[PDB]
Amino acid sequence: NLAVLKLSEQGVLDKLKNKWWYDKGECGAKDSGSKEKTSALSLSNVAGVFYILVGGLGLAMLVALIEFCYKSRLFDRGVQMLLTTVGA
Amino acid sequence: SIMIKKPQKSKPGVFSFLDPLAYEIWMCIVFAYIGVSVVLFLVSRFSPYSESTNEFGIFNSLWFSLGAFMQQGCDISPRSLSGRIVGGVWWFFTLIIISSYTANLAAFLTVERMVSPIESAEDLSKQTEIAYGTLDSGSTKEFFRRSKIAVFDKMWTYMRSAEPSVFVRTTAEGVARVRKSKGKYAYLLESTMNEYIEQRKPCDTMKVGGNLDSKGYGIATPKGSSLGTPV
Amino acid sequence: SIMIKKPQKSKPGVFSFLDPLAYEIWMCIVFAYIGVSVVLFLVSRFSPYQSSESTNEFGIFNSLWFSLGAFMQQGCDISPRSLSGRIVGGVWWFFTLIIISSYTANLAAFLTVERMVSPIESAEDLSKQTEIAYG
Amino acid sequence: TLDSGSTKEFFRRSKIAVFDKMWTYMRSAEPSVFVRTTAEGVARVRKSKGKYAYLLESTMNEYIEQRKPCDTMKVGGNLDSKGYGIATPKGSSLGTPV
Amino acid sequence: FAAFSLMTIAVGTDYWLYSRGVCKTKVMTHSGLWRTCCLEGNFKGLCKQIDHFPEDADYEADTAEYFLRAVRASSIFPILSVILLFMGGLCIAASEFYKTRHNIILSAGIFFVSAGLSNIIGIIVYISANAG
Ligand SMILES: N[C@@H](CCC(=O)O)C(=O)O
Ligand SMILES: N[C@@H](CCC(=O)O)C(=O)O
Q: How far is A56 from chain E (nearest CA, A)?
A: 11
Q: Is it true that the peptide bond before B202 is cis, omega within 30 degrees of 0?
A: yes
B80 C-beta closer than 6 A to ligand 1:
no
d(CA B30, CA E120): 11
Cα four-point dihedral sign E44, E50, E53, E56: positive
D7 labelled ligand-binding:
yes
Q: Collapsing DSSP states into helix, strand and coil, what is residue D10?
A: helix
Resolution (A): 4.2
Contact residues on chain C for A47, CB-CB shorter than 8 A: 14
Report the alpha-carbon distance of residue E99 to residue C1 in Å, rounded.
80
3-class DSSP assignment, residue B78: coil
Point out which residues pair with E17 in neighbouring strands: E31
**Helix (H), strand (E), coil (C) string for C109-123:** HHCCCCECCCCCCCC
| Phi and psi at residue E15, to the nearest 5° | -110, 95
Is A4's Cβ below 8 Å from some Cβ in E? Answer: no
How distant is the Cα of E79 from the closest Cα of chain C, in angstroms? 24
- In chain E, domain spans: 1-132
Query: Measured between alpha carbons, how far is C85 from C36 in angstroms, rounded to an integer?
Result: 10
Instruction: Show the CA angle centred on residue C67, arms to residues C65 and C72, nearest 5°.
Output: 100
Q: What Cα–Cα distance (Å) separates residue C74 from each residue in A52, B31, C58?
A: 20, 23, 18
Instruction: Tell me which chain A residues have a C-beta less than 8 angstroms from the C-beta of C15.
Output: 48
- For residue C56, CA distances in Å to B97, B225, C43, C60, C82 come to 35, 113, 11, 12, 9
Q: Contact partners of C by the rule of 3+ C-beta pairs under 8 A?
A: A, B, E
Chain-centroid distance of CA B146 in Å reads 40
Tabulate helix, strand, coil % of chain B (nearest 5).
45, 5, 45
Sign of CA dihedral A75, A77, A82, A83: positive
The alpha carbon dihedral of E79, E82, E85, E86 has a sign of negative
φ, ψ dihedrals at D81, nearest 5°: -135, 90
What SS3 class is residue B188?
A: strand
User: What is the torsional sign of CA C17, C21, C26, C27?
Assistant: positive
- CA atoms in the 13 A half-sphere facing the CB of B104: 24
Length in residues, chain D: 98
What is the fold, at CATH topology level, of the domain defined by E1-132? Answer: Butyryl-CoA Dehydrogenase, subunit A; domain 3 (1.20.140)
Write the CA distances from A64 to A59, A70, C116, integer angstroms. Answer: 9, 10, 45
Is B190 close to ligand 1, i.e. is its CB under 6 Å away?
A: yes
- Contact criterion met (CB below 8 Å) for B79 and B96: no
Distance, in Å, from the CA atom of B73 to the CA atom of B60, rounded to the nearest integer, reads 13
**CB of B40 within 8 A of CB of B83?**
yes
E57 contacts C5? CB cut-off 8 A: yes
**Nearest C-alpha in D relative to A14:** D80
Judged by CB atoms closer than 8 Å, whether chains meet at E64 and C5 is answered as no
Atom of ligand 1 nearest to the CA of B140: 7
CA B59 – CA B63 distance, rounded (Å): 7
Residue B42, number of CB atoms within 10 A of its CB: 21
- Chain A touching partners, 3 or more CB pairs below 8 A: B, C, D, E
Method: cryo-EM
Closest ligand 2 atom to residue D7 Cα is: 7
CA–CA distance, B24 with E21 (Å, rounded to integer) = 22
How buried is residue C92: exposed, middle or buried, by Cβ count under 10 Å (0-12/13-18/19+)?
buried
Say whether the peptide bond before residue C119 is cis (omega within 30 degrees of 0).
Answer: no
- Measured distance CA(C103)–CA(B103) in Å, rounded: 11
Contact C108 B92 (CB under 8 A): no
Burial class (CB in 10 A: 0-12, 13-18, 19+), A76: exposed
Mutate-to-test residue for ligand 2 from D3, D6, D80, highest number of ligand atoms within 8 A of CB: D6
Q: Does E56 touch chain C (CB under 8 A)?
A: yes
In a mutational test of the E interface, the residue from A41, A42, A44 whose CB has the highest number of chain E CBs within 10 Å is A44
Distances from the Cα of A83 to the Cα of A77, C41, C59, C128, angstroms: 10, 20, 20, 53
Looking at all shown ligands, the one closest to residue B218's CA atom is 1
Give how far A11 is from chain E: nearest CA, Å: 42
CA distances to A45, A54, B130, D69 from E132, rounded to whole Å, are 11, 21, 34, 53
* Cα separation values, C84 from A29, B35, C41, C67, Å: 60, 41, 11, 16
Does C72 reach chain A within 8 Å, measured CB to CB?
no
* 8 A C-beta contact, residue B83 and residue B76: no
Taking a C-beta distance cutoff of 8 angstroms, is the pair B33, B65 a contact? yes
- DSSP for residue B168: B
Nearest to residue C111, comparing CAs of E24, A43, A88?
Answer: A43
R_g of chain A computed on alpha carbons: 36
Cβ-Cβ contacts under 8 Å, B155 against chain A: none
Distance between CA atoms of D27 and D31, rounded to whole angstroms? 10
